[PDB]
Amino acid sequence: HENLYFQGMRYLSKDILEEVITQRPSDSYKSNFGRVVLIGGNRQYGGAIIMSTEACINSGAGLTTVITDVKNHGPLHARCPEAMVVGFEETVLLTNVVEQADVILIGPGLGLDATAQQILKMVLAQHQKQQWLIIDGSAITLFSQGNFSLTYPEKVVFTPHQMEWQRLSHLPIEQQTLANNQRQQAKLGSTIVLKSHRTTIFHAGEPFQNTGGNPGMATGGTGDTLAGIIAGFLAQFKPTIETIAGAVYLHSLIGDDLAKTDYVVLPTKISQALPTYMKKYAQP
Amino acid sequence: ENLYFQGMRYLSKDILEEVITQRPSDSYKSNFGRVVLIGGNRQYGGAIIMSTEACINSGAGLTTVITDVKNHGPLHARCPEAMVVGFEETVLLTNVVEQADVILIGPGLGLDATAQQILKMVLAQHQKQQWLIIDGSAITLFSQGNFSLTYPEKVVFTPHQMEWQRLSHLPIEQQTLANNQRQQAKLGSTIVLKSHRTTIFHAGEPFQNTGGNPGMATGGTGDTLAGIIAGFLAQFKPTIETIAGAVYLHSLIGDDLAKTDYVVLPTKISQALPTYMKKYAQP
Amino acid sequence: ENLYFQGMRYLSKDILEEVITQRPSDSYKSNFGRVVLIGGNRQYGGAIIMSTEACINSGAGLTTVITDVKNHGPLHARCPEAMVVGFEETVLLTNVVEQADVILIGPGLGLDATAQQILKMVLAQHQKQQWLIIDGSAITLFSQGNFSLTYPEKVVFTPHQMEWQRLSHLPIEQQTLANNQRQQAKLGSTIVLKSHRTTIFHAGEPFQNTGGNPGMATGGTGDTLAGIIAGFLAQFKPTIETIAGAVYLHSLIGDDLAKTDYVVLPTKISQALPTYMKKYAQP
Amino acid sequence: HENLYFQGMRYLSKDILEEVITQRPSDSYKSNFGRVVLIGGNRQYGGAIIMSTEACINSGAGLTTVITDVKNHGPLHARCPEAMVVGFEETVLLTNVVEQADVILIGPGLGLDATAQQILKMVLAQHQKQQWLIIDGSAITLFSQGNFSLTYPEKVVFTPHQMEWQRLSHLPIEQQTLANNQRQQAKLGSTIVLKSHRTTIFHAGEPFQNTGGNPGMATGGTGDTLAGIIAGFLAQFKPTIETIAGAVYLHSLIGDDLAKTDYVVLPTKISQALPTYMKKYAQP
Ligand SMILES: [Cl-]
Ligand SMILES: [Cl-]
Ligand SMILES: [Cl-]
Ligand SMILES: [Cl-]
Ligand SMILES: [Cl-]
Ligand SMILES: [Cl-]
Ligand SMILES: [Mg+2]
Ligand SMILES: [Mg+2]
Ligand SMILES: [Mg+2]
Ligand SMILES: [Mg+2]
Could you say which residues bind (6S)-NADPHX here (chains A, D)? Predict the structure, then answer.
């Protein structure tokens, strides 16, 4: 059989990487490549945020700050000394770093407890119109349970797996059709990166359909890694949803390549491959 | 010359082709199992760190480590994929054990009262669908306490010879094929009896591993094996062939590394799992 | 087209052949200098960790890091060669500074009272034979306080443009070759004025670096440079050519890595130092 | 010019590696490869003991335990999870591990303070005739200042650089002649590994003269690394001074090889090369 494609949907290929990944201007400094703040990693799940951090740094973000439990700062710096670190208890400093951010990612390893809830509320309250805000993992669950309302939804990006999306959209998985998914995207006014074997991105335009991904990537940290890549991309590249699609595509391209040799693809190997892959596509 | 026993089954690469399946296209991480690894007191925390690296690299979908909070930092520096729970975190520890598909207890665990209490809790809650691997000092604790098995057929012990002597009451001299088999039967569990040619006793005919080398005779080799067994049970068919494939792969990689390496660092075996498993994955 | 200034000297590989000497057969580690690196508060500890890796890989004989005790663990995980002293350890800190051949203060240092007190102590004790490199926030602190230089000719400042504006009082618009040179003269120190083409102002004719690329425009690149400068001054002739060679090598490695790497991790530059330096070592 | 050699002195070559590094018997277990205890690393100098630990593990020691400040246990396990760890405060446990050891190394990063002094005295008091005891670095200085006397000197190995040897032997560097060095070795009844550009080993037999070493190795940690190799060798191989000479030779062979490509030879690179080098010489 030949493939079947849905009309009104953009199927992703290397084309998206050529479009999104631009050659850096010779007059650039690190501030031109964005300030990212990554928020997550409670005391049980600190490795999640460490994996997002490695992805963000390796994707080319200019400056990366991590708000995470102080417990996690040691191993984070052992792996990623490029990252700056702020503890959850550091109320004023964490507010300062969020205020300065170009991109905020909240959710990897964040958990569901009262501290997690408080930090999410502070971030949602503090969010500025021009800042990208990526809500991932347990932050989606808390968002849906806290009956919040988004002030500036147009630069919010949710990255749910199917059960997180059920919770956010109230669409049972059986009802998560292209039409229904799009309608529920429209109701939020935000971008939905609906993760699956073939991730789909819903937004104000024609949806993007990812064409990669493999079950060798079905391991803890793959999603944390993707979230970090998305954040690093939004930090550096044009503020359009194509940039998010480029991140999603590159994540699965690298993972698909690694799976050719690796039965399970360690998520940190995708991050470590970013600089060489991005160089190959950088639009000259 | 070799002495062969007619009832004995000799492992080869065939076991890997049988056990290691191609993953289905529609799989998600929960399909490849939730593993809980329990061990690593304040002296021996490296042991659980080595088991964890083996488990993650073997392809387990999710890995949580219950170990002294002292060890959480170095563990995450090496293995950020792992989730971590301290020995003091009683409610959380209980929850993660309850949710696990495979529980490994023992690497670096030591012999203290906290170790006995967690073993007690794990054994009390053991569910029929869960695999429980009891390794190292946890075997000593099990044998010395009045601990019993509700579902022995889902329990795997991984003793060295002195641990088997404690568990089976067979002195090393008396550890013959027939006597070993008889004491397995009495337990109703799988016994991975570690030696130069590790032998696996179970309800069927015993398996003997044909590999292994003294370049692997270094601290951590057994902790590594235990993590591979855990990861294999998390992903593959619930049969003793799955356990045999873990044992065989561990020594295959070790034997290959020993061709170039005088001593084989146990973490190198773990690091080679993804490439070896791809090679043998039943296509 | 390029604009050339007749008084300006353009760096090339010749500077490396001049600076990087073959080590004498009878050398010991103290011959390659004692470096003290001072920085890394609780938010920015990675910065001092990156300077330390650069310093060690550059060939400094002994490296001690004065940084918050929070940072000592990850630093040793990455750089076990480094010795570590906390900010609170006042007698020991004073001793290591006294014994140093080269002192670098600033990477990740922040602006708090402890940072001001240590800067004060370093400046007060500065010995004529010691090199002192003042980097990052330490430049801000120096300029805002009533700090002065007893031996300015052994002091190197490494400002970005806004730090130079604070130190020299020249707004960016006014930062011309002539004005920059005049404010160097007023200080009597070496100014490594970081930009796309870093320019070094000193008592002689200025040097301009000819390399550098936006793949290096990431957090840590400057912390790395500062460690290379420190290591070079610890080992090589006490002249401004030594500083120029550090600047040039840093960007040579970065420019080479950028051929394959979209962003150049600063730690990769550090890791490449031993192989690059061997290649250029004046035979 | 052709070389000049001293009569009554064995000049080392790969021959020593073939002699010392034996093929392991197929019936071996980890206990056959010795229990080593490494003691050092105060709060300032913890990296020293971490470097000795990596050398010891990579050299093939069966089991390695480190008695070091608890501060150091995290980074030690991040690099060397094979090692077991005991804090200086753990009086009973540290005594237990020393009692069981086949080889004790004391001194890398140990420092000179009261805790260092106490631990050295405990170890010297506890030493058993059959145990190898390597006294390195600041432990040599403390040994010389504490006017100690060795109970079983024949299995003590001192590893001084020239100024440490001046302190131990009272020979000014000018007076450190072959004859004088040997006489002062004889007075102690111990092995002296007198480290230099061309390390010399004095003992009850003809001295060994190392023929390698280079100034690319003149960096902090080189000596800590050597001490760990010596300890791992004594753990596994025949209890003769040739074993110590083999360790010293291999350390400089690897360092000399690495210096061909590396301006400075990171000491941890020597350790990481041990398994491949030892395989090449293992006497079949
Ligand atoms: Cl985690
Ligand atoms: Cl994930
Ligand atoms: Cl404990
Ligand atoms: Cl601070
Ligand atoms: Cl150290
Ligand atoms: Cl040393
Ligand atoms: Mg702003
Ligand atoms: Mg359940
Ligand atoms: Mg002095
Ligand atoms: Mg004994």
Answer: 48, 111, 161, 224
Q: Do A47 and B73 touch (CB under 8 A)?
A: no
Is the Cα dihedral A79, A85, A89, A95 positive or negative? negative
Superfamily of chain region C9-283: Ribokinase (3.40.1190.20)
| Cα dihedral sign, A110-A111-A114-A118 | positive
Which CA distances in Å does B98 have to B103, B122, B126, B132, B268?
10, 9, 8, 12, 32
Residues of D in contact with C26 (CB under 8 A): 197, 215
Q: DSSP 3-state assignment of C151?
A: coil
Question: A86 has which bridge partners?
Answer: A67
Comparing CB atoms, the residue among A32, A64, A275 nearest residue C262 is: A275
> Scanning the structure block, which residue is given the tokens 């490396």?
C16
**Rounded Cα–Cα distance for residues A192 and A156 (Å):** 9
Alpha-carbon B20 to chain mean position: 17
How far is it, in rounded angstroms, from Cα C264 to Cα B226?
39
Binding residue per annotation — A47? no
Cα-Cα end-to-end distance for chain B: 37
Largest CA distance in chain D: 60
Identify residue D197 by its one-letter amino acid code: H
Contacts of A80 in chain D (CB under 8 A): none
- Rounded Cα distance between C133 and C158, Å, is 7
Is D24–B214 a contact, with Cβ atoms under 8 angstroms apart? yes
- Cα of A100 from ligand 7 centre, angstroms: 5
Q: For chain C, how many helices (H) and strands (E)?
A: 11, 10
Residues in Cβ contact with A21 at an 8 Å cutoff, skipping those fewer than 6 apart:
A237, A246, A278, A281, A282, A283, C262
Neighbouring residues of D240: CB distance < 8 A, sequence distance ≥ 6: none
Helix (H, G, I), strand (E, B) or coil at B15: helix
Alpha helices in D106-219 (DSSP H): 114-126, 138-145, 162-169, 178-188
Query: What is the CA(B97)–ligand 8 centre distance, in A?
Result: 9
- Residues of chain C found within 8 Å of residue B74, distances taken between Cβ atoms: 77
| Class of the domain covering A10-284 | alpha beta
DSSP string, B92-138: HHHHHHHH-SEEEE-TT--SSHHHHHHHHHHHHH--TT-EEEEETHH
Choose, out of B57, B109, B262, B269, the residue to mutate when testing the contact with D (most D CBs < 10 Å).
B262
Q: What's the sign of the alpha-carbon dihedral B53, B58, B63, B68?
A: negative
Q: How far apart are CA C102 and CA B15, in angstroms?
A: 61
Helices marked H in D23-149: 46-59, 73-79, 91-100, 114-126, 138-145
- How far apart CA B152 and CA B168 sit, in angstroms, is 15
Query: In residues, how long is chain A?
Result: 284
Of A211, A279, A282, the residue nearest A245 (C-alpha): A211
A101 vs A235: CA distance, rounded Å:
9
Neighbouring chains to A with at least 3 Cβ pairs closer than 8 Å? B, C, D
D197 is known to lie in a ligand binding site? no
What the block records as the tokens of A146 is: 């806290």
B chain contacts of residue A214, beta-carbon cutoff 8 Å: 23, 25
CA distance B73 to chain C (A): 9
Q: What is the resolution of this structure in A?
A: 1.8
CA D68 – CA D38 distance, rounded (Å): 8
CA distance D222 to C247: 28
A158-171 b/e (C-beta count within 10 Å ≥ 16 → b): bbbbeebbbebbeb
Beta-bridge partner residues of C204 = none
Q: Which residue has the tokens 């010596």?
A: D230
Tell me the C-alpha distance between C81 and A32, whole Å. Answer: 35
Instruction: Round to whole Å and give the CA distance between B275 and B218.
Output: 23
Q: Is D117 helix (H, G, I), strand (E, B) or coil?
A: helix
Helix (H) or strand (E) holding B233: helix B221-235
- Give which of A112, A199, A263, A266 to mutate to test B binding, by max B Cβ within 10 Å: A263
